[PDB]
Symmetry: C5
């Protein structure tokens, strides 16, 4: 349970990293 | 078996993250 | 505790990797 | 040995993900 | 010690992946 919690913790912030990445790429389209 | 399952779980969503990344880069080509 | 420390160590530099990534994407906007 | 194998398995596909990423960025050069 | 070595091994190539990523993004600025 503890091990899985640590893994989830990393995924937590990752979610923001990815989402932000996609958002940034789309933003590049700004034409 | 349990350990591998956890690893696969992470890869599962990763597949979408990567595929989306490639799709976004290609989309940038919009010219 | 030692295991978590190792994980955090990787995240440490990652923080810079991501932050730099976002900064670079934004920089691309330079128009 | 089993542990290292699992790690290598992840790296295997990763190789394609990265290589593709670089290829896509270069493709963006399309000018 | 062996565990840390394996982790470092992954980070080793990662260094090149990231470094290349930043270099590619900057290259995009070619204007």
């Amino acid at each position: 349970e503890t091990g899985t919690l640590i893994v989830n913790s990393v995924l937590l912030f990752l979610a923001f990293v990815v989402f932000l990445l996609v958002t940034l790429a789309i933003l590049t389209a700004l034409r």
